[PDB]
Amino acid sequence: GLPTMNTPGSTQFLTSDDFQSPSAMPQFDVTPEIQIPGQVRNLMEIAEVDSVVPVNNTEGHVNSMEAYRIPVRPQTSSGEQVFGFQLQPGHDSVLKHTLLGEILNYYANWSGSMKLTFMYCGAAMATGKFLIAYSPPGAGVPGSRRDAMLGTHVIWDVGLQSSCVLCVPWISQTNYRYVTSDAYTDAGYITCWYQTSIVTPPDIPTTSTILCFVSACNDFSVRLLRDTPFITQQALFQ
Amino acid sequence: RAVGRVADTVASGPVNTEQIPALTAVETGHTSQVVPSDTMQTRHVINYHTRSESSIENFMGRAACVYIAQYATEKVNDELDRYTNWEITTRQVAQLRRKLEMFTYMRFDLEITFVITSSQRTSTTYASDSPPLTHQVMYVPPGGPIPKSYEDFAWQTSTNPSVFWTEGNAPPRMSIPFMSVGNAYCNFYDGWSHFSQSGVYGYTTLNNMGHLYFRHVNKSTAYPVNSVARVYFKPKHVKAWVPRAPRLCPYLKARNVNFNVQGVTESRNKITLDRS
Amino acid sequence: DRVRSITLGNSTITTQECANVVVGYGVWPTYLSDHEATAVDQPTQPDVATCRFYTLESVKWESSSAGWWWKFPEALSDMGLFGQNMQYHYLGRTGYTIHVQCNASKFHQGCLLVVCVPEAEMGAATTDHAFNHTKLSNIGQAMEFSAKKSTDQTGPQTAVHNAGMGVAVGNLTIFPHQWINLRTNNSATIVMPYINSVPMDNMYRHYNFTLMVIPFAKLEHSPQASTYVPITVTVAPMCAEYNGLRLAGHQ
Amino acid sequence: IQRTPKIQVYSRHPAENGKSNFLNCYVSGFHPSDIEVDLLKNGERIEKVEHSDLSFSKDWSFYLLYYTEFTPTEKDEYACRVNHVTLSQPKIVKWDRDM
Amino acid sequence: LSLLYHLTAVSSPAPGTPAFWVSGWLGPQQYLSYNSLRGEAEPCGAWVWENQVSWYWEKETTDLRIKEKLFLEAFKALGGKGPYTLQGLLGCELGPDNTSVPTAKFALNGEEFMNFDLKQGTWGGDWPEALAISQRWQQQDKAANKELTFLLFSCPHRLREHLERGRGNLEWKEPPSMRLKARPSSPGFSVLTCSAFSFYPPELQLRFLRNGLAAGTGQGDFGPNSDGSFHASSSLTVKSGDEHHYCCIVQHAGLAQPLRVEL
Amino acid sequence: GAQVSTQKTGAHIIHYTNINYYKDSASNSLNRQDFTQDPSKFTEPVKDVMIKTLPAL
């Protein structure tokens, strides 16, 4: 017949190939699809949805709802630190189990800008200002509010519009960063500081709550599929 | 511009306006669309990245193992009989289940590939000349007559699709179309089976894909071998709806969603960062 | 603007501190089209006898409350002609309009999360044991979560930080949701379309979606303020239609 | 879903006096979880009574044989006393020597 | 002749009692007992009167530890508050000469609700409690194949292992002791009894006659004994006169004539 | 059929030929080149449209 020649790579099973194969049940009449609402055509559509960040995960708070409640209270001296974490959105313990981190942990490269939304859940009569800052990774962690005002930051004033968005910009020497973070592609630090204080009229409780929210901006991107280091099994589930 | 490519960043300047892009209300259930060119001064950057690796086709389109079926050439126990079976489900491995549990209703064709390996069982001697083994994998639809044992009437596969494979060649592979009676595979089902709200609870009531029976075509060997047939599934032509939140606690069973409670995340010492 | 008035049937829900009206996945509830239906008989469509605002019982929000859940359509199984049409019919199809409401003050603080989870298949309290149906949902009783784990023999796992589904409770925002912040908001209104794999479904064997109300920031106030703040749920079916008429159910 | 038992009292051997005989008491047709059968000698509880293997008939109703090593004479009258979830009082059945 | 197993498991057992117990019946008399409180199966000293050296009785013990776990993993996917007594009938009967016919019935709360099919499915019933147990039982992934090779392959081979081993129990021909006695009653009538004691075969048809003509069977009762023997009874309210003519023409399987007994 | 289509390359001879051989649509290869998307169902599920630069309330 036709004179062929089997190239290297024949009779192999590469698990991520793209080939045709004979159907087992020929001329099967499938059921018609209908208009089910809420179709997903890309996993990045999921990663653009906010999910509340467990910033208060100091043990043992991961076994309650207190992992999400970031406490704020009236201070004596200003310029204190509210919270802070490194920006490792698939490896840091604060971010890697939010909705962004579970999508990122299926991949190995990530790129783009990120949003951080802070909804103040105190009383309607309390008033405060906060400084929410991002620091690129050159110099280390900012140890004071004076070191934090030199970075990318935004000064949030609470009021009727009860949430301010810090948009973490993409500053990197590489086009992508590794998800499981290493020393070469560090991404920096997110800190938040008391701009003035929390000032309240009498007969209001002291401690309040700020909820964080992480998502992805419209230029986010992932690459290089893998498995997650989250789910394990020893045997087949009977 | 092409489709799939992410958006650029327009050049911004200093502003002092009534407009407040940074302030919003989360209470309305609405994600803010604050691009970085709203809260700082940016340069025009022509972004060339695409989102090809993140679509539902490429996210699912890699073949994953779903079952490990074992069957010998000589009965030793009911478990290591001449034949074995498997109820077709994707809920027995932990890798593919967590991917398919990200969406509520999915609709896809399938591509089933078998990696079959035999190993000679431990005895007091092993010197035997054997011809190459031939395996049979018969797919039984819901309602079909099942084989009772070896040499059954029902291995004649008068209408059931079957495959025959001699060891040493390429692995077998056949494609399965969309098989459900509804309009999408229900990955979840918050409901009961009977109308009195009792019986079995959960997703097992709908997904009846059928069985899958394995055996050796060869009648016997001189010394018994133990074959193992790993089954690989690859979803192709995938549509998905209603994205669920990804599972956190590891699984316990194949018919349930039961779990032990776990932390929301890992712990750390304090809420602040304390270096210079 | 902040005010919004909703009129359905012979009832009318008004509010003066509203956030907005989140609507499902952008899809308004409609009737079933001719190129999608399967059952061949003429469906019944009572437009105002069943598409109106039914008000469930009120729950008490405390500073130690973990959360509540209702399961639909089973939560409206006796509210009027929506209950009677569920019994005399084999199939049903509807969308909803869930309006949760909770006013406190300008001196209270707290935050609720109102989610409609489609097919919130719940795990079991103790494993290796299936549970009763009356511990999943009674007819109108607000089934509630718990702070710690639950060791019930015949119930669901009601640890609120795992939300009954073995999932992180912070990630419940991809389902259609709103927040009731006592600082700003007062009510939360969600419109949910019919979400199922089959175009119509039986309304007794299958809970279509679960409404959850989870307090994230806990309720705090002075001891001299109003100690009792209630939460009230007001559900209204939308574009309901039924098929397969037979005797009264539901066995 | 509830059954009431049936007591049938009889002897193994014919009641020939002097030698020890066996009073086989038959309880049948009952569905509790637990039943209490007791053998009696004119109001005296016999201490040592042997139990048979508790089983069920073809219609999913249990049956159980209790028996003692009794000496039949004219004055030795016997009875069976059974306890159920259905019957409040324990049912008296008097043993007749003619069967 | 047929081998049969009588499985029963209760949810909340009475203390001091087993929660699961087996009674094996080679036809009409019992040969096998098992429970949970001792954890092994023993004979009654009735059928074999031998001790098999770890080749026959050691596999019956290991077989019923499997059946104990299947009968205790049942409540466990019953979500009711009430107690449950799960019953089970297992075994096979012999065909014409070969090809034994099996049987497998189960009963929850004294009512038959499921029965392991033969083709598909392995277990099934229209009751809501039947699908819950059937989905629970096949979760262990091999118990359904355990009973498929049980009813068609092992216990009929065990039956042909028993078809020629113990034939002295298949010839138990004990002719009974029959003692016509009588009691008095209400004025005008009398109460008659004819009874039979300690007989092995299960067939006996005892009736009452006036002179030479049949007058009725009476109320026939039945009960076995502590030694593989049975018992019958028959009573009738008869006339206070003519007691010297009521005859009891009754055959037996250990007898070749329907012997007459006297008052 | 000869559905010649473009290849997946980088940015700053590139065609490929594909022939279907079987009589079922479920025997084909994957549809790896469909990157159409809209996240507005999940990020903006709101009735009244919310302008970005305006107050939300």
Numbering used by the authors:
A (entry chain C): 1 to 238
B (entry chain A): 9 to 284
C (entry chain B): 11 to 261
D (entry chain F): 1 to 99
E (entry chain E): 5 to 267
F (entry chain D): 2 to 13, 24 to 68
What does the paper say about this structure?
The genus Enterovirus within the Picornaviridae, a family of non-enveloped viruses with a positive single-stranded RNA genome, is comprised of more than 100 serotypes. Human enteroviruses (EV) are presently classified into four groups, Enterovirus A-D (EV-A, B, C, and D), among which EV-B, the largest group, consists of over 60 serotypes, including all 6 serotypes of coxsackievirus B (CVB1-6), coxsackievirus A9 (CVA9), over 30 serotypes of echoviruses and more than 20 newly identified enteroviruses. The capsid proteins (VP1, VP2, and VP3) adopt the classical eight-stranded anti-parallel β-barrel configuration with the N-termini residing inside and the C-termini exposed on the surface. Most of the uncoating receptors bind to the “canyon” sites of the viral particle, dislodging the “pocket factor” in VP1 and subsequently triggering conformational changes of the intact particle to release the genome, albeit that SCARB2 binds EV71 outside the canyon.
We also determined the atomic structures of E30 in complex with its receptor FcRn and CD55. We determined the cryo-EM structures of E30 F-particle in complex with FcRn and CD55 under neutral conditions at 3.3 Å and 3.6 Å, respectively and obtained atomic models for these two complexes. However, in FcRn-bound viruses, the pocket factor was released and the pocket partially collapsed with the side chains of Tyr147, Asn215, and Met217 repositioning to decrease the pocket volume, similar to the pocket observed in E-particle, whilst there is no notable reduction in the amount of the pocket factor in CD55-bound viruses, indicative of that FcRn is capable of triggering viral pocket factor dislodgement, but CD55 might only facilitate viral attachment at neutral pH. FcRn inserts into the canyon depression of E30 through the α2 and α3 helices. The FcRn-binding site on E30 comprises residues from the VP1 BC, VP1 EF, VP1 GH, and VP2 EF loops, which form the north and south rims of the canyon and bear antigenic residues [see coordinated submission by Wang et al.43]. The VP1 BC loop is longer in E30 than in most EV-Bs (for example, 4 residues longer than in CVB3), and residues Asp86 and Glu87 in this loop, together with residue Asp138 from VP2 EF loop establish charge interactions with residues Lys80, Arg140, and Lys150 from FcRn. Overall, hydrophilic interactions dominate the tight associations (with an interaction area of ~1150 Å2) between E30 and FcRn, where 14 viral and 14 FcRn residues are involved in forming 16 hydrogen bonds.
